[PDB]
Design a protein around this ligand. Structure first.
Ligand code: FAD
Ligand code: CL
Ligand code: K
Lengths: 609, 34, 123
């Protein structure tokens, strides 16, 4: 058809209205920048609202604390894939960030003496791991994420932030190596909007829906990740995906390990408590990834449950119902609402479930998006990223609990501060070519009228199952290679898509097909990166490569060792690229940043084992 | 009293049982975070 | 809820500029695309059952129910019985949603539906 094209000019455009995007947009607008915020959802429907837990900051309200101890915990948790300059930045800023959020109106819970109440969480420690549990985790009642969104969205409006609500960003407007804005679809009326700006912030969230089981809202489709890929820019560490072992089958709702702490057990199709064979001491309270791998082996060997023999059972019905009702109030209701299960007589169907994407768009600690040219890091002019879509990398190979609301506010603010320090409101906005974005519109039109042999639903499910079966917790060469072939085959299937809705008013069919394209790019890079990485580090663990492969053997004194060349160890970030036309994946690597922002303020933590 | 936890005297915090009592963060048996 | 009292957001408005087909299509999107999986699943399934069959009055009641509240969790708790809904939401559509969430026939509500129900007949 014909596509009405509308042009806009802003100082800055933020793609995303979750915690990260709202913090960036509010920050820019408060600083005087004419700021647009493009979001495919009303802002409080962002997945940030799902966060009913907390946010870490070393306020020291319950004991003496030091943000440098939070730095240490985060570095160690990252398994030394985390960039220590970004982790320094984030943990040093967190105390002020949380107090600022309270000042903005977030009603953080309080101690009897008026301080922000804090909980132990995430394995956090005092005195660089030597001093017992730290209490850093702060919250707003049972709705920290919602409070964050409501507060930042509401405050942004006082500074005239311009929202494009239910607009779907299709691509970046790149010209000669610089970002000049974004091209987006108005979902309500089908018009195409080219939003020009001197600076663009990508804050689009995760890509959990590449898998069959994830905790994400159904909006988590990797759209900004894919825009980066389509610009020929690298994504980073996409193989590092954090899983929980006991999500409800299909739904992805995580069931608390408290069910197993109270005596719940995992059962296979033969009625066996199989965790006794994989973890004779810890049994069903073995570590997350041990449990997930054990479940997967059971399923792979034909002992999975259900009609497709593709999950296992979490059995609670041997426990006294009084115990369930008293110690786990609500588990009966949750299991009934989604699985239709009465936990006093039926098991819950469960399987390992994606919860967090450590990987994403590589940035420096300022939120500036990086390319990797001639083996050197180099910022992309006019382009920023923050939040779960980004890879700063504060989480490295494993995110700590309650650090993932923190990175939203720290790096959302960092993007705004970086723009404020390098630019002024009203600076000339770079022009774009009159046909800029044409290819995005061509792709949209092809999907709108797609009349092939594979429906969006069919390709989507096949992708999700293939990722679940080949690129989840259980990783080994032969299975990863099989999965690489499958995902490459499904990428080729995008050319055979079948859609149905040919209109342009609230065309959810079309939007979910764009989302599938984006997911498929993310899936390709995740599984090829995982196949290439022949080591175990944090959430990536391989049955054929069970050891963390660093530049030294850090299990032994370093004195007298020969350092391994960069190309012969794995303590390095994966960089992934896709030739969109052919589906060809290319991998490169860049070093982990071990230097902090200031060694005198915060010492680099050497890798340890 | 309405919004004050009788045990910890936390004000305006999570309702019902302590969400982190098992080490993760749970609500109604759902694991929110870990 | 101090932040929500001191920081009020733009109010929800019933829309009068939409054909019934447009309103149904918008509420489909806004049912499927929620901030947590719980309401993505429950509201996408509820929408499949009802949107194409509702009257305009029912659509407007549903619109207010799922789109006026700032917090998806408030809707989820109203529907699953953990909290009572404000009087503005006490009507037949809320009654339908509350009864649906109870899952009295112990069905599996584990996935949002594929969209073919809108376009193809079941063979
Ligand atoms: C169920 C759950 C519970 C969690 N609980 C906690 C917790 O207690 N504590 C914690 O620290 N972490 C928690 N996490 C992790 C943390 O909540 C998330 O990592 C974080 O909220 C992500 O925020 P974000 O701003 O990066 O993205 P999101 O909040 O996902 O927002 C992404 C934004 O991008 C927009 N967008 C996406 N694609 C497009 C497009 N194509 N066009 C336009 N706009 C687009 C969306 O509309 C949305 O506004 C939880 C995660 C989940 C899934
Ligand atoms: Cl053991
Ligand atoms: K990430």
């Amino acid at each position: 058809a014909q596509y009405p094209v509308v042009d806009h000019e802003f100082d800055a455009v933020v793609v995303g209205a979750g915690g990260a995007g709202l913090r960036a947009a509010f920050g820019l607008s408060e600083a005087g920048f004419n700021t647009a915020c493009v979001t495919k959802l009303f802002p409080t429907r962002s997945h940030t609202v799902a966060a009913q837990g907390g946010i870490n900051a070393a306020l020291g309200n319950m004991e003496e604390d030091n943000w440098r101890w939070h730095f240490y915990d985060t570095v160690k948790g990252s398994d030394w894939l985390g960039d220590q300059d970004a982790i320094h930045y984030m943990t040093e800023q967190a105390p002020a960030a949380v107090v600022e959020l309270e000042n903005y109106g977030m009603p953080f819970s309080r101690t009897e003496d008026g301080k922000i109440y804090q909980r132990a969480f995430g394995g956090q420690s005092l005195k660089f791991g030597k001093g017992g549990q730290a209490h850093r985790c702060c919250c707003v009642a049972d709705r920290t994420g919602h409070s964050l969104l409501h507060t930042l969205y509401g405050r942004s409006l006082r500074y005239d932030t311009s929202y494009f609500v239910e607009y779907f960003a299709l691509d970046l407007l790149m010209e000669n190596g610089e970002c000049r804005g974004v091209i987006a679809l108005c979902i309500e009326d089908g018009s195409i909007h080219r939003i020009r700006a001197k600076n663009t912030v990508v804050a689009t969230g995760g890509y959990g829906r590449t898998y069959f089981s994830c905790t994400s809202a159904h909006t988590s489709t990797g759209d900004g990740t894919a825009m980066i890929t389509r610009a020929g820019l690298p994504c980073q560490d996409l193989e590092f995906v954090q899983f929980h072992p006991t999500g409800i089958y299909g739904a992805g709702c995580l069931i608390t390990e408290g069910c197993r702490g109270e005596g719940g057990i995992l059962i296979n199709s033969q009625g066996e408590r199989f965790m006794e064979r994989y973890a004779p001491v810890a049994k069903d309270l073995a570590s997350r990834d041990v449990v997930s791998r054990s479940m997967t082996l059971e399923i792979r060997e034909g002992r999975g449950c259900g009609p497709e023999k593709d999950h296992v059972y979490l059995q609670l019905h041997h426990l006294p119902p009084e115990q369930l009702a008293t110690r786990l109030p609500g588990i009966s209701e949750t299991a009934m609402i989604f699985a239709g299960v009465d936990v006093t007589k039926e098991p819950i169907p469960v399987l390992p479930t994606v919860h967090y994407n450590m990987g994403g768009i590589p940035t420096n600690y300022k939120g500036q998006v990086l390319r990797h040219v001639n083996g050197q890091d180099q910022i992309v002019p006019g382009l920023y990223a923050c939040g779960e879509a980004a890879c700063a990398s504060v989480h490295g190979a494993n995110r700590l609990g309650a650090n993932s609301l923190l990175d939203l506010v720290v790096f959302g603010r960092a993007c705004a501060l970086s723009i404020e320090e390098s630019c002024r409101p009203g600076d000339k906005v770079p022009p774009i070519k009159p046909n800029a974005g044409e290819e995005s519109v061509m792709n949209l039109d092809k999907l709108r009228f797609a009349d092939g042999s594979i429906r969006t639903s069919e390709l989507r499910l096949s992708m999700q199952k293939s990722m679940q079966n080949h690129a989840a917790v259980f990783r080994v060469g032969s299975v990863l290679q099989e999965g690489c072939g499958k995902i490459s085959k499904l990428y080729g299937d995008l050319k055979h898509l079948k859609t149905f809705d040919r209109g342009m008013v609230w065309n959810t069919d079309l939007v979910e097909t764009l989302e599938l394209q984006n997911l498929m790019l993310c899936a390709l890079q995740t599984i090829y990166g995982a196949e290439a990485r022949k080591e175990s580090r944090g959430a990536h663990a391989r049955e054929d490569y069970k050891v963390r492969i660093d530049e030294y053997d850090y299990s032994k004194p370093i004195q007298g060792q020969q350092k391994k060349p960069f190309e012969e160890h794995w303590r390095k970030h994966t960089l992934s690229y896709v030739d969109v036309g052919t589906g060809k994946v290319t991998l490169e690597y860049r070093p982990v940043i071990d230097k902090t922002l200031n060694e005198a303020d915060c010492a680099t933590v050497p890798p340890a084992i | 009293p309405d919004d004050v936890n009788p045990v910890t005297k936390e004000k305006g915090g999570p309702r019902g049982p302590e969400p982190t009592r098992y080490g993760d963060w749970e609500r109604k048996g759902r694991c929110i975070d870990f | 809820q101090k932040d929500m009292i001191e920081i009020p957001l733009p109010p929800w408005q019933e829309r009068t500029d939409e054909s019934i087909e447009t309103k149904r299509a918008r509420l489909l999107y806004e049912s499927r695309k929620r901030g947590m999986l719980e309401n993505c699943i429950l509201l996408s399934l509820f929408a499949k059952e009802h949107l194409q069959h509702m009257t305009e009055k029912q659509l407007n009641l549903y619109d207010r129910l799922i789109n006026e509240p700032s917090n998806d969790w408030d809707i989820y708790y109203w529907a699953t019985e953990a909290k009572p809904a404000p009087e503005i939401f006490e009507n037949e559509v809320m009654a339908l949603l509350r009864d649906f969430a109870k899952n009295k026939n112990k069905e599996q509500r584990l996935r949002a539906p594929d969209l073919e129900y809108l376009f193809e007949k079941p063979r």
